[PDB]
């Protein structure tokens, strides 16, 4: 990912003059994944604009190879004493990280939260990100259920056990499917955000459920794997697949018909607006406490537009 989408705000006020000429921001996010590359695009755009105004923003971009709730706490505690003006967090475990945030705030360092979900019950100054993973799950599930004519069998790739946004999307899937009583959810399995596991899960489902009619995929990786397995079995377009996020393989699968709908989030503004609001916070200025970046459903007719803008 090198650009943004049409979701990004075109009317965001950046006229405020920062009360310093230099700022240092430590970013710590749940785990390495291509998804975060789309946020980093917004960060790098804000730093450029602020460099033209004689303002130098330096930042570190840290995430572990695999998610580790304690590592995230440790990353916050250790950054406190390293001379950062603000700590930006994409959250692993809200309760554990909340307390780590409060410790950083108590010791004089403001904290921003960004990305997939907010920690509203902690002393973070502001949030920029998706305020509604449940709704994203509902959007995908409604689209797939309606495309299936409100009847048939759906299987659910459910991602990583206990991951907040995965679990909220999954709750949205099920609450929505419940509104179509002629649809049966035959199974749900945890791919753990691994493409190969999503492939193997889907392969098993194609054997076990000859009548499978739809698959819902709650993270950026599992639509890739569902589409690959469905295409390899010759079932592209005959099983209705809906998934999260913007992997180029998923967006290309929209064009070829294997994927029906992708739910793309405004990752760019998560990073772009994080920087500008961080500065207002470091300076003591007020800023919107919760900025919702938004998301939208992308079908085949919008695939090329999103591919071109993101890649």
Automatic annotation (TrEMBL):
One of its GO terms (molecular function) is carbohydrate binding. Its main location: other. Keywords: Signal. Residues 31-286 form the Periplasmic binding protein domain. It is found in: Cell envelope. Transmembrane segments: none annotated. GO terms for cellular component: outer membrane-bounded periplasmic space. The keyword Cell cycle does not apply. Belongs to the bacterial solute-binding protein 2 family. This is Periplasmic binding protein domain-containing protein. It comes from Acetivibrio thermocellus (strain ATCC 27405 / DSM 1237 / JCM 9322 / NBRC 103400 / NCIMB 10682 / NRRL B-4536 / VPI 7372).
């Amino acid at each position: 990912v090198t650009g943004k989408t049409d979701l990004a705000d075109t009317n965001f006020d950046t006229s405020y003059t920062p009360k310093r000429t230099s700022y240092k921001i430590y970013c710590t996010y749940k785990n390495i994944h291509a998804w975060y590359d789309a946020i980093k695009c917004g960060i790098d755009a804000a730093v450029k604009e602020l460099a033209e105004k004689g303002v130098t923003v330096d930042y570190e971009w840290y995430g572990p190879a695999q998610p580790d709730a304690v590592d995230q706490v440790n990353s916050i505690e250790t950054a406190i004493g390293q001379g950062w003006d603000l700590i930006a967090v994409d959250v692993n475990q809200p309760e554990l990280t909340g307390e780590a945030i409060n410790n950083a705030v108590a010791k004089g360092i403001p904290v921003a939260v960004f990305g997939t979900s907010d920690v509203p019950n902690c002393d973070r100054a502001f949030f920029v990100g998706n305020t509604d993973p449940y709704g994203d799950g509902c959007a995908l599930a409604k689209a797939v259920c309606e495309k299936m004519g409100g009847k048939g069998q759906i299987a659910i790739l459910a991602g990583t056990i206990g991951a907040l946004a995965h679990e909220e999307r999954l709750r949205g899937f099920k609450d929505t499917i419940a509104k179509y009583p002629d649809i049966e959810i035959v199974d749900e399995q945890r791919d753990n955000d691994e493409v190969e596991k999503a492939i193997s899960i889907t392969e098993s489902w194609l054997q076990a459920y000859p009548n499978l009619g739809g698959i819902l995929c709650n993270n950026m990786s599992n639509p890739v794997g569902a589409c690959q397995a469905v295409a390899d079995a010759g079932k592209s377009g005959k099983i209705v697949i809906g998934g999260m996020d913007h992997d180029l393989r998923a967006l290309n699968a929209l064009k070829d018909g294997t994927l029906y709908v992708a739910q793309v989030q405004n990752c760019y503004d998560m990073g772009y607006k994080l920087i500008y609001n961080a500065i207002k916070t470091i300076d003591g200025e007020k800023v919107e406490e919760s900025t919702a970046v938004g998301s939208t459903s992308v079908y085949a007719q919008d695939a090329d537009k999103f591919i071109n803008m993101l890649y």
